[PDB]
């Protein structure tokens, strides 16, 4: 079934401003400080061009250049409410997007003459950084998540379509990060910020928020957002990146997020006041649920960042956030969803995704054919660039298959590259590696094909092979510490698999296939079609395995290994009562 298709670049960072006008027209508004404009599609999301908004559509009095205001349709009136990411006013439409707009006053009236700066002084100003207005309780209430970076998320609530407002009694919070190993310092503290909210079929609200932890945190409301439960970790991995929840016409829930694990903090990292560097925003993922979140499927990469391997990744526009974080979605038909995602004009995209692809149970790859589109292989030059970035290099390269043919295969080794080391930071990204996504499974079978490079190897040369539940950097040697299953291929004294205690030898100068068949807390490992050993689960997962990760283990420059094919098949383990 159709792979994700890039169709355009939105005129603002993703997360706000994407709105369906009618069955064929979809718009994405902008944060422009000049005359308002939007990107528009008149063929239900296929093709796009820029267009000026009419003079009755208000300028961005608040907000910022890189982000659109949020624009949300009131399901009862079919008019719209607009709020900014930060600052500005509350506008309500009369006659749709190209109709008359009115601004909400502090006393709960409507101002037609909002172009008058004096009259703008008695307009309602909702505080905090805001995300997306959401209509709940059969359209009778609208709530807007807002946060303070240190204080957490609460909700602006209106029961009269946006004329008058109050604040929730509480909201969502999440704990500070602790600099335990392998961290050498503290992650930027964000207290459950940038929430997305979904109304469940029974009326409960689910809030999912960005944190300093390894995963998003969540809380629930039984009173349409007045009060919220004690916050807890969610199942959606990711740190200092953003979540979006939505619902399709048939009731299926969609979760969009950046399913990554950042590199551990380095010795230069602070105490939570400010971040160091982002090493975790070069992907976006999708999962779906047909049973109000009791079970999930997919956890598929929508896209990898095209610039991820580039030594000039941050070189231009140093202060501006970039990558594939943030998203907003609009259903296009029964099977297809339009997603705006990412940050920075060179990185943000509009992508169409098919739910039947989300529900697929197999995937296969060959490094030489598929590196650019499907493989994460970047390492970082650990020298801070711009506000919070690192420039990159590919950590592995393609070489000729020594067997002959046209096949190109990926050489994964310990690099000799001083640019990948920072002694003061106390980090060393010279171990090359590679990681690849597949549909999530609590049970499955993954096979890969590898060969020892005919060259000098160090005493600890080899490959650590891990099944994981999010995308770990190619150069992250700590992946094995978070892995669901992990084991080393060791090259010295002679080549062998270490499967706990058991050494399983294999020949140099030849291709070998390894299989990993996992189910529950065990994986059976096979070598060239013969059972070789068993691995105990190293870490539990709320979801299952959706990545395989391969990283070199050598501590001195070496020749390493070659990686050819990978394939995966996972199974549905259906709900039943025999437990």
Q: Kindly list the residues in this chain that would bind Cl ion in the complex (CB under 5 A).
A: 61-62, 84, 87-89, 156, 165, 167, 293, 309, 311, 321, 391
Toward Cl ion, which CB reaches closer, 41 or 546?
Answer: 546
Toward Cl ion, which CB reaches closer, 347 or 512?
Answer: 347
CB 329 within 8 A of CB 318: no
CB 358 within 8 A of CB 4: no
The closest of 121, 36, 24 to 82, measured between CA atoms, is 36
Toward Cl ion, which CB reaches closer, 44 or 425?
Answer: 425
Give 452's strand partners: 561
**What are the φ and ψ backbone dihedral angles of 213, each rounded to 5 degrees?**
-85, 180
Toward Cl ion, which CB reaches closer, 57 or 485?
Answer: 57
Toward Cl ion, which CB reaches closer, 308 or 336?
Answer: 308
Toward Cl ion, which CB reaches closer, 96 or 274?
Answer: 274
Q: Residue 168 and residue 153: Cα distance in Å, rounded? A: 10
Which of the 8 DSSP states describes residue 13?
B
What's the closest the beta carbon of residue 371 comes to Cl ion, in angstroms?
Answer: 7
Q: Residue 347 and residue 356: Cα distance in Å, rounded? A: 26
Q: How many CB atoms lie within 10 A of CB 93?
A: 22
Q: Residue 39 and residue 51: Cα distance in Å, rounded? A: 6
Toward Cl ion, which CB reaches closer, 69 or 533?
Answer: 69
What's the closest the beta carbon of residue 335 comes to Cl ion, in angstroms?
Answer: 24
Q: Catalogue the E-assigned strands of 349-442.
A: 349-354, 362-366, 378-385, 389-394, 397-400, 408-412, 421-422, 427-428, 433-441
Toward Cl ion, which CB reaches closer, 63 or 495?
Answer: 63
Span between the terminal Cα atoms of the chain, in Å:
35
What's the closest the beta carbon of residue 491 comes to Cl ion, in angstroms?
Answer: 28
What's the closest the beta carbon of residue 296 comes to Cl ion, in angstroms?
Answer: 9
What's the closest the beta carbon of residue 91 comes to Cl ion, in angstroms?
Answer: 7
Q: Residue 205 and residue 228: Cα distance in Å, rounded? A: 9
Q: What is the dihedral of CA 232, 235, 237, 238, to 10 degrees?
A: -50
What's the closest the beta carbon of residue 244 comes to Cl ion, in angstroms?
Answer: 15
What's the closest the beta carbon of residue 160 comes to Cl ion, in angstroms?
Answer: 13
What's the closest the beta carbon of residue 236 comes to Cl ion, in angstroms?
Answer: 10
What's the closest the beta carbon of residue 276 comes to Cl ion, in angstroms?
Answer: 14
Toward Cl ion, which CB reaches closer, 298 or 533?
Answer: 298
DSSP for 42-111 reads: SSTTS--EEEEPPTTSPP-SSSBTTBPPEEEE-TTT--EEEE-SBSS--EEEESSTTSEEEEEBTTS-EE
CB 88 within 8 A of CB 62: yes
Q: Residue 440 and residue 546: Cα distance in Å, rounded? A: 4
């Amino acid at each position: 079934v159709p792979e994700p298709e890039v169709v355009a670049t939105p005129p603002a960072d993703a997360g706000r401003g994407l709105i369906r006008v009618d069955s064929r027209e979809i718009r994405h508004y902008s944060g422009t400080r000049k005359e308002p404009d939007y990107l528009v599609s008149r063929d239900n999301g296929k093709t796009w061009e820029m267009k000026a908004a009419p003079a009755g559509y208000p300028p961005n009095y608040g907000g910022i250049p890189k982000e659109s205001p949020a624009i949300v349709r009131n399901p009862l009136t079919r008019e719209f409410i607009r709020v900014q990411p930060i600052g500005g006013f509350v506008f309500l439409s009369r006659g749709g997007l190209d109709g008359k707009w009115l601004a909400v006053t502090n006393d709960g009236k409507l101002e037609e003459d909002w172009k008058d700066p004096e009259k703008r002084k008695n307009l309602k100003k909702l505080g905090g950084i805001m995300r997306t207005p959401v209509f709940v309780n059969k359209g009778r209430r609208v709530i807007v998540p807002f946060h303070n970076m240190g204080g957490g998320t609460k909700f602006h609530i209106s029961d009269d379509g946006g004329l008058t407002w109050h604040v929730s009694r509480n909201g969502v919070t999440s704990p500070r990060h602790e600099a335990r190993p392998p961290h050498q310092g503290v992650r930027w503290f964000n207290n459950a910020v940038e929430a997305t909210v979904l109304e469940m079929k029974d009326g409960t609200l689910w809030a999912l928020a960005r944190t300093s932890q390894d995963q998003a945190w969540q809380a629930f409301s039984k009173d349409y957002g007045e009060t919220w439960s004690k916050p807890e970790p969610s199942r959606f991995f990711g740190t200092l990146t953003m979540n979006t929840l939505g619902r399709l016409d048939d009731g299926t829930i969609v979760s969009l997020w950046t399913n990554t694990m950042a590199l551990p903090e380095n010795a230069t990292a602070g105490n939570g006041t400010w971040e160091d560097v982002f090493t975790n925003r070069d992907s976006h993922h999708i999962a779906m649920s047909g049973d109000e979140g009791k079970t999930w499927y997919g956890f598929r990469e929508i896209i990898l960042d095209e610039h991820r391997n580039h030594p000039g990744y941050a070189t231009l526009d140093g202060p501006e956030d970039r990558g594939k974080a943030y998203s907003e979605m609009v259903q296009l038909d029964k099977n297809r969803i339009l997603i705006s995602l990412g940050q920075h004009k060179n990185h943000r995209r509009l992508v169409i995704v098919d739910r039947r692809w989300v529900g697929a149970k197999t995937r296969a790859t060959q490094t030489g054919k598929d590196l650019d589109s499907q493989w994460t292989i970047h390492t970082y030059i650990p020298q801070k660039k711009g506000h919070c970035s690192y420039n990159r290099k590919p950590s592995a390269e393609l070489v000729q298959d020594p067997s002959g043919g046209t096949k190109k295969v990926l050489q994964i080794k310990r690099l000799d590259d001083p640019e990948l080391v920072n002694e003061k930071s106390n980090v060393d990204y010279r171990n090359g590696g590679a990681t690849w996504n597949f549909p999530n499974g609590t049970t499955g079978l993954v096979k890969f094909r590898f060969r020892v490079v005919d060259g000098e190897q160090a005493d600890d040369s080899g490959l650590q092979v891990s099944l994981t539940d999010r995308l770990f950097n190619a150069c992250d040697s700590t992946t094995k510490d978070y892995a669901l299953f992990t084991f080393p291929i060791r090259l010295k004294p002679a080549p062998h698999l270490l499967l706990g205690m058991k050494k399983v030898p294999f020949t140099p100068g030849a291709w070998h296939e390894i299989s990993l068949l996992w189910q529950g807390g065990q994986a059976v490992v096979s070598l060239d079609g013969k059972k070789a050993g068993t691995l105990k689960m190293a870490n539990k997962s709320p979801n299952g395995a959706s990545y395989i990760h391969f990283i070199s283990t050598g501590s001195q420059p070496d020749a390493g290994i070659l990686l050819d094919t990978v394939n995966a098949r996972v199974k549905l383990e259906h709900h039943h009562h025999h437990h």
